């Protein structure tokens, strides 16, 4: 009762699906290898960090990114699959934003990178909508009690990124230096950018 179905190893299944389609001429030459390189090398949270660092140092860009995120992203050439309609959500001294896809894994791939295992976990999908403060605390991020947490559930085509607050002690840093501290987790909304000493 309630046992798993019998299954061949997953890698055997996955490559069976490839070979079945490839052997019918349905997969162009180099097609899955090309998508693998896109996924690994081009879709990257370095791109969302670049966007946050520009917004932090350019009030006009900041305004653009918060009003028409798609156009802002397009300036950099970072629109792409699962990241065609972009909304950036602004953290403030009383508001902390966090992104999930409760139904599956929906993420702004080109600017955040493909989601991490933990973001697609049942634990995150179930819990962050209902108890985001406790989830973040458990993950290492304490949100002061004076801050509304707002969770965006990525249920349609909008693809989100968080614009975190700029931490004190970064005044006058270059865009390069600022990018370095805007991590994947800061874009998702579960981490606050950290300044070393």
């Amino acid at each position: 009762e309630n046992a798993a179905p019998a299954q061949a190893p997953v890698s055997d299944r996955a490559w069976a699906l490839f070979r079945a389609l490839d052997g019918k001429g349905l997969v162009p030459d180099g097609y899955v290898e090309g998508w693998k390189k896109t996924f690994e090398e081009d879709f990257s949270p370095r791109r969302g960090a670049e966007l946050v660092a520009r917004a932090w140092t350019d009030p006009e860009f900041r305004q653009l990114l918060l009003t028409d995120g798609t156009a802002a992203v397009a300036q950099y050439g970072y629109l792409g699959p699962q990241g065609e309609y972009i909304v950036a959500v602004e953290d403030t001294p009383t508001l902390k934003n966090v992104i999930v896809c409760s139904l599956c894994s929906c993420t702004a791939w080109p600017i955040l990178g493909l989601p991490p295992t933990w973001y697609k976990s049942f634990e995150y999908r179930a819990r962050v909508v209902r108890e985001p403060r406790k989830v973040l605390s458990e993950m290492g991020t304490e949100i002061a009690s004076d801050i509304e947490i707002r969770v965006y559930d990525t249920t349609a085509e909008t693809r989100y990124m968080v614009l975190p607050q700029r931490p004190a002690g970064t005044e006058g840093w270059s865009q390069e230096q600022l990018q370095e501290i805007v991590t994947k987790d800061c874009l998702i909304g579960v981490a606050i950018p950290q300044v070393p000493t």
Binding site: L21, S121, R130, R133, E138, I149, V151, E157, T158
Partner: protein
């Protein structure tokens, strides 16, 4: 579809398996893991055989215990394979033959889907809306926690998309609708049993009605 995939709000799960900024390792942790997505794109963009929405639905159609025990990327292997069999492109026999053993698929759909709603309303930013108290056995992009609940519009998209509940079944009658960012108070969705502030759900126009 009120499946086990509609996880938001479910209680009893443990800790998220991460601490912030921990090393998540490479993009793909096994040499096959790029295949589901790549093959979804082949199916959507090169073959024209199905929509992305049909991929989301076929994963929802995994047998529920099968869904709950299956790692993420494997669910998409199963789902894309299932769609290739359902569309007549592949056979389950040849998948099993090449795999060298069992390759169970998602279950058949129990709904033909539904069309884009004929009657809907253009809402504006600041407007109070309720999520229609409807039950859809087929695909729908409405998590049950917001069904029948009331919130306020913070955005109407400037683009329109096919209605999931149609195009997720491959129907010809998905139309196009904008979606709306609907902000609900935490207490509207979970009563006193939440530590949160608000939740914003991106909801198709066809899932909404004016509030009381």
């Amino acid at each position: 579809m009120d499946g086990v995939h509609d996880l938001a709000g479910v209680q009893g799960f443990g800790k998220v398996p991460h601490t912030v900024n921990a090393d998540i390792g490479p993009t793909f942790h096994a040499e096959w893991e790029h295949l589901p997505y790549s093959l979804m794109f082949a199916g959507v963009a090169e073959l024209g055989a199905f929509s992305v929405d049909e991929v989301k639905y076929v994963v929802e159609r995994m047998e529920p215990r099968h869904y709950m025990m299956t790692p993420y990327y494997e669910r998409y292997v199963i789902g894309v394979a299932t769609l290739m069999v359902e569309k007549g492109i592949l056979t389950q026999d040849e998948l099993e033959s090449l795999a060298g053993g069992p390759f169970p698929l998602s279950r058949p759909s129990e709904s033909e889907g539904r069309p884009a709603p004929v009657e809907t309303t253009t809402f504006e930013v600041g407007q109070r809306v309720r999520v229609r108290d409807e039950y859809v056995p087929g695909h729908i992009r409405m998590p049950a926690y917001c069904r029948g609940r009331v919130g306020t519009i913070s955005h109407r998209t400037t683009e329109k998309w096919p209605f999931p509940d149609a195009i997720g079944h491959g129907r010809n009658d998905a139309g196009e609708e904008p979606t709306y960012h609907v902000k609900f108070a935490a207490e509207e969705l979970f009563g006193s049993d939440t530590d949160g502030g608000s939740v914003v759900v991106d909801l198709f126009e066809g899932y909404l009605e004016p509030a009381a």
